[PDB]
C-alpha cells in the first residue's frame, strides 16, 4: 500500500511522462519515456496496459489510472528488486556507482537541460560517502528523501 | 525570518531542496518504467498460461472420446472349423472398428452403435459356441 | 518411475494416434497426446521437448521417449488454482468475470497468440448464457476437470 508521500514522489514521476500537463497521457507518452529509459515495449503491449485502466475507453488516462496501471501482485523480494533494477538504470555499466557522466546520460534521455556544473551538483548532494560517485545505498537514501 | 542573513540561509536550504526534488522525480521515474516492464510481462505470462490451458482443453475434448472409444472396443476384443471361422470372423470385424477409430475422427455416438453392433452380433456367436 | 496403472493409460493413448504400432507417432504428435492425457505446455516448452529428441530430424518419437517426457512435464504443473489466478488478472473489477470481447483481445494479441477460430469454440462453452460475460472460475473448474 502507497503511502500519501509515495504518491506523491510518484506524481512528480508522472510529470515526465505528462509533459504537457493536461494531467492524461497515451500509450505514444508511454512508450516514449520508457524507451528513453532503456526498456523495448511494443504497441501491442502499450495498447493493452492502457485497456486495463482506462475506463472511458477514451485511449487516455489519467494519473490514478496511471498508479493502478502500476500494480500486481508482487513476491517477497520483488519491491527490493526493483529499486536494484531503478538503481541499474542509472549505474548502466554495472560498476556499482552512479557517476557523473552516467547521471547525465539519464537526464539527458527524459530530456532534463542542465549544465555540467548543475549535474555535479547533484552528485555531491547524493555523495555522502564522499568520492564523486553514487552508490546503491545513497542513492536508495536520495529516493527516499 | 526577515534578516538578510536568515535569508540567505534560506536560498540555501531551498536550493539543496530543489536538487533532492530533481532526483526523486527522475528516480521515481526510473522506477515507474520499472514496474511498467514488469506488468507487460506478468500479464503475459498470465495470458500465456490461458492459452496454453485453453490448447490443451480444445484437444483433450476432441480426442479424449476417441480414446475411449477406442479402449471399449479394444476391451471386447480381449474378452474347429466350423467354430473358429465364425469367431475369427469376429475378431476382424472388431480390428476393423478399432481401425476406423485410429482413423477417422468420429463422435461417441457413431463409435457406439457401431460398438453395440458388434456386441450383439459377439454374444450371439459366443452363445451358440 | 511411474505408476504401472498410469503407464498403461498412456500407451492407451499413445497408440489412438500410432497407427502402424511400431511404437512410434509424429514429433507434431506429440503435443496432441500430452494434451489428451490432460497436460498443458506452452508451445515454447513443446518445441524444446522436440528440439532435445529430433536431433536427427526424423521426426518421430516412440513410447520410451513420450514417457520420459510426460514425467518431466508432472513433476512441474499448474494447479487450477495458479490457472484461475491467471485469468483473475485480467478482471479489471474483480466480478469473477470476464466479457468475451475482453478475453478475445488479450488472447489473439499476447503471449502465444491463439486464432480467432480457437476463440470462438471457447466463448461457446465459456458464455453458453450468450450474455458475452464469462464466468472463469467455473470455465476453469471444467477445463481442468
Ligand atoms: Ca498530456
Ligand atoms: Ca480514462
Ligand atoms: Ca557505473
Ligand atoms: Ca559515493
Ligand atoms: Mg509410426
Ligand atoms: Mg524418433
Ligand atoms: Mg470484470
Ligand atoms: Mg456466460
Redesign the interface.
Known amino acids: 500500500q502507497l503511502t500519501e508521500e509515495q504518491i506523491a ?2 506524481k ?6 505528462d509533459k504537457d500537463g493536461d494531467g492524461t497521457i497515451t500509450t505514444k507518452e ?1 512508450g516514449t ?2 524507451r528513453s ?3 523495448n ?1 511494443t504497441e501491442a ?1 502499450l495498447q ?2 492502457i485497456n ?1 485502466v482506462d475506463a472511458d475507453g477514451n485511449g487516455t488516462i489519467d494519473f490514478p489510472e496511471f498508479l493502478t ?4 501482485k508482487m513476491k517477497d523480494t520483488d519491491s527490493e528488486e ?2 536494484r ?2 538503481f541499474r ?2 549505474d548502466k555499466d554495472g560498476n556499482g556507482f552512479i557517476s557523473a557522466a552516467e547521471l547525465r546520460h ?2 539527458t534521455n ?1 530530456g ?1 537541460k542542465l549544465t555540467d556544473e548543475e549535474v555535479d ?2 552528485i555531491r ?2 555523495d555522502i560517502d564522499g568520492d564523486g560517485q553514487v552508490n546503491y545505498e545513497e ?1 536508495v537514501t ?2 527516499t ?1 | 525570518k526577515s534578516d538578510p542573513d536568515h535569508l540567505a540561509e534560506l536560498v540555501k536550504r531551498v536550493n ?1 531542496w530543489l ?22 510481462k ?19 475434448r476432441r ?2 472420446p ?2 475411449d472409444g ?2 471399449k472396443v479394444g476391451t471386447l476384443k480381449k474378452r474347429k472349423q466350423e467354430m473358429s471361422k465364425q469367431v475369427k470372423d469376429l475378431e476382424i470385424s472388431i480390428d476393423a472398428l478399432m ?1 476406423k ?3 477417422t475422427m468420429m463422435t461417441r455416438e457413431q463409435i457406439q452403435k457401431e460398438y453395440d453392433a458388434l456386441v450383439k452380433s459377439s454374444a450371439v456367436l459366443l452363445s451358440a459356441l
Chains 1, 3 share one sequence.
Not at chain 1, 12 to 17: G, I, Q
Not at chain 1, 69 to 72: E, H, N
Not at chain 2, 19 to 40: E, G, P
Open positions: 514522489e510518484f512528480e514521476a508522472f510529470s515526465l511522462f508511454l519515456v520508457m529509459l532503456g526498456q515495449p503491449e493493452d496496459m486495463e496501471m502500476m500494480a500486481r526493483e529499486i533494477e531503478a538504470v542509472f539519464v537526464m527524459l532534463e551538483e547533484m548532494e547524493a542513492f536520495m529516493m528523501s | 539543496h536538487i533532492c526534488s530533481r532526483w526523486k522525480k527522475v528516480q521515481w521515474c526510473s522506477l515507474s518504467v520499472i514496474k511498467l516492464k514488469n506488468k507487460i506478468y500479464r503475459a505470462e498470465a495470458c500465456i498460461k490461458m492459452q496454453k490451458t485453453i490448447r490443451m482443453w480444445l484437444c483433450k480426442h479424449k476417441r480414446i477406442l479402449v481401425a477409430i485410429k482413423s
